[PDB]
Amino acid sequence: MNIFEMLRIDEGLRLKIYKDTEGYYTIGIGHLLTKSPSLNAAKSELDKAIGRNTNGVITKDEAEKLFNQDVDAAVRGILRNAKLKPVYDSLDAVRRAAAINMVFQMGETGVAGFTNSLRMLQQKRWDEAAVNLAKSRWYNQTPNRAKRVITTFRTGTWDAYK
C-alpha cells in the first residue's frame, strides 16, 4: 500500500466532470475543479488544467497526471506549513500517508481546526487522537472514509485499507 493507492481507493476515478460529496465540480481522482455552481466555469477550469479543449472529458492518463500533481502539491503544502510541518515530521511513514489524505481532501485550511488533534498526534497519543478526530464535521459527513484514515492514525498500519 501507498499514498497513491490509498487515495485512489478513497477518491475513485471518473473521467467525466462530476459532483463531489459536497456538490462541487470535480473530475479524475478527486481533483476539485471549482466551488462555483457553473458547469461552464468548471469546464473552463478543466481546459486550463489539461491544456486543451476537453469538453468536460479527459483520458485516464490525463487523470493520473492531475493526481500526481495534486499529490505533490499536498506534500509540498504540508512542508511549507509551519503548523503542519512539525507534526508531519514527527510521524512514521504510514501515518504521514494519513496526514496527506486529509490535506488532499480538505486542504491546508480545512485541516486548520484540527489543532487539538494535531497536538495529540504530535504527542503520539493515538487512541485519544482517534477519538478527537471523530468529533468533527468531516467524520459526520464522510464517515466511512474518515474511519479508515482514523484507523490508520490510531494503528499506524494499512489494515483499514486491506
Ligand SMILES: C1=Cc2ccccc2C1
Ligand atoms: C492531519 C494530521 C496532520 C499532521 C501533519 C500534517 C498534516 C496533517 C493533517
Ligand SMILES: [Cl-]
Ligand atoms: Cl492544476
Ligand SMILES: [Cl-]
Ligand atoms: Cl464516506
